Amino acid sequence: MENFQKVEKIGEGTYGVVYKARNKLTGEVVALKKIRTEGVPSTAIREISLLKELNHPNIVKLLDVIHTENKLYLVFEFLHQDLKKFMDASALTGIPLPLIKSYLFQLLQGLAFCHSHRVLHRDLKPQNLLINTEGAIKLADFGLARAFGVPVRTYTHEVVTLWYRAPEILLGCKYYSTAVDIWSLGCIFAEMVTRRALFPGDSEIDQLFRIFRTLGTPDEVVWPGVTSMPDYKPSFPKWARQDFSKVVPPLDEDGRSLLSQMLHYDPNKRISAKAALAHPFFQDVTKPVPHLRL
Numbered sequence: 548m549e550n551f552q553k554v555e556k557i558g559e560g561t562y563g564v565v566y567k568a569r570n571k572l573t574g575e576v577v578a579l580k581k582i583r584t585e586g587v588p589s590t591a592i593r594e595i596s597l598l599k600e601l602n603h604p605n606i607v608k609l610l611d612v613i614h615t616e617n618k619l620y621l622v623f624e625f626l627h628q629d630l631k632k633f634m635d636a637s638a639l640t641g642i643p644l645p646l647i648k649s650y651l652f653q654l655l656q657g658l659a660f661c662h663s664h665r666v667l668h669r670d671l672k673p674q675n676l677l678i679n680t681e682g683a684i685k686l687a688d689f690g691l692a693r694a695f696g697v698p699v700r701t702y703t704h705e706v707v708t709l710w711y712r713a714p715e716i717l718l719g720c721k722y723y724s725t726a727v728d729i730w731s732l733g734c735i736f737a738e739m740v741t742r743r744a745l746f747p748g749d750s751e752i753d754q755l756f757r758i759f760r761t762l763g764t765p766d767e768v769v770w771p772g773v774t775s776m777p778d779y780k781p782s783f784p785k786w787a788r789q790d791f792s793k794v795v796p797p798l799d800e801d802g803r804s805l806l807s808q809m810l811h812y813d814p815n816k817r818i819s820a821k822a823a824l825a826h827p828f829f830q831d832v833t834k835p836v837p838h839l840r841l
C-alpha cells in the first residue's frame with residue numbers, strides 16, 4: 548500500500564509474498580504478508596482478528612489485519628532471521644547445546660501459551676521460527692492454518708514441506724490436536740542437534756515411511772486405533788524401531804528422553820508443551836546470546 552515503503556522482499560511464504568516494510572508515519576519496520584483470492588471469507592477474517600489478541604514473548608506479534616480489494620494483508624512484528632538460515636550458518640560447528648536448549652525451552656513456552664488458548668500452529672518448521680540478537684526465538688504464523696486451510700502446494704507452484712508433519716496428519720486424521728505441534732518441534736529439536744533433517748520425505752508416503760523406518764511401523768500396541776485410520780493400509784511394510792542413541796547422537800539421555808516423548812506415535816501419549824517444560828532436560832537451562840550476522 549501507500550502507507551508502506553516496501554524495503555525488500557523477505558520472501559514467499561505458503562500463503563503469499565512477504566515484504567519488509569516501513570510505516571510511512573510511525574516509522575515502524577514490520578513484516579507485511581499479502582494473503583493469496585476472490586472475496587476473502589468473512590469466517591477467515593474473524594478467526595484472524597482473534598489472533599491479534601494472542602500476545603506472548605515467544606509468539607510473533609500480529610499487529611494488524613487489513614482486508615481490502617479481495618486482498619488480505621497481515622502486518623507482523625519484524626525479526627531479522629529465521630532458524631533455517633541460522634542452522635545453515637551454524638552447520639560447520641553446530642548450534643551450542645545451551646542455545647539449542649534455550650530455544651527449545653522458549654518454543655515450548657510459546658506452544659504452551661497458544662495451546663492453553665486453544666490455538667494450534669499445524670505447520671511448524673525452521674522457517675517460521677524467528678530469532679533476534681537478544682537470544683529470543685518466536686513462533687510465526689500461529690493459527691493461520693485453521694483460520695484458512697491448505698492446498699497442494701503453497702499458492703503458486705511451491706512445494707509444501709512435509710518433513711515436520713505428525714503421523715496422524717499423514718494417516719488422514721481429520722481432527723488435529725495440539726500434539727501435532729509437539730511432533731513438529733521434536734523434529735526441529737533433532738535437526739538442531741544433528742544438523743540434518745530428521746525425516747526429509749519428498750512425498751507423503753516417503754515421509755510416512757521415513758518415520759516408520761526410524762521409529763518402527765506403528766501397530767495397535769503402541770498406537771491404539773492406528774489400523775482404523777483413513778489412509779492406513781495393512782500392506783505398509785513392517786519396520787523394526789531403531790535405538791534413539793543412533794537417531795540423535797551425541798545427545799545425552801535427558802535430551803533423548805524428552806525427544807522420545809515428543810515423538811510418541813499416539814497423539815494422546817505424546818508429551819504436552821506444559822509437561823515438557825518440567826522435563827529434567829531443562830534443569831540447567833539458560834539464555835545464551837547467539838552470534839548473529841545480519
Ligand SMILES: NC(=O)c1cc([N+](=O)[O-])ccc1NCc1ccc(O)cc1
Pocket residue numbers: 556557558559560565567577578580607623624625626627628629677687
Ligand atoms: N515476521 C518476520 O520478520 C518474518 C516474516 C516472514 N514471513 O514469511 O511472514 C518470513 C521471515 C521473517 N523474518 C525473518 C527474515 C527477515 C529478513 C529476511 O531477508 C529473511 C528472513
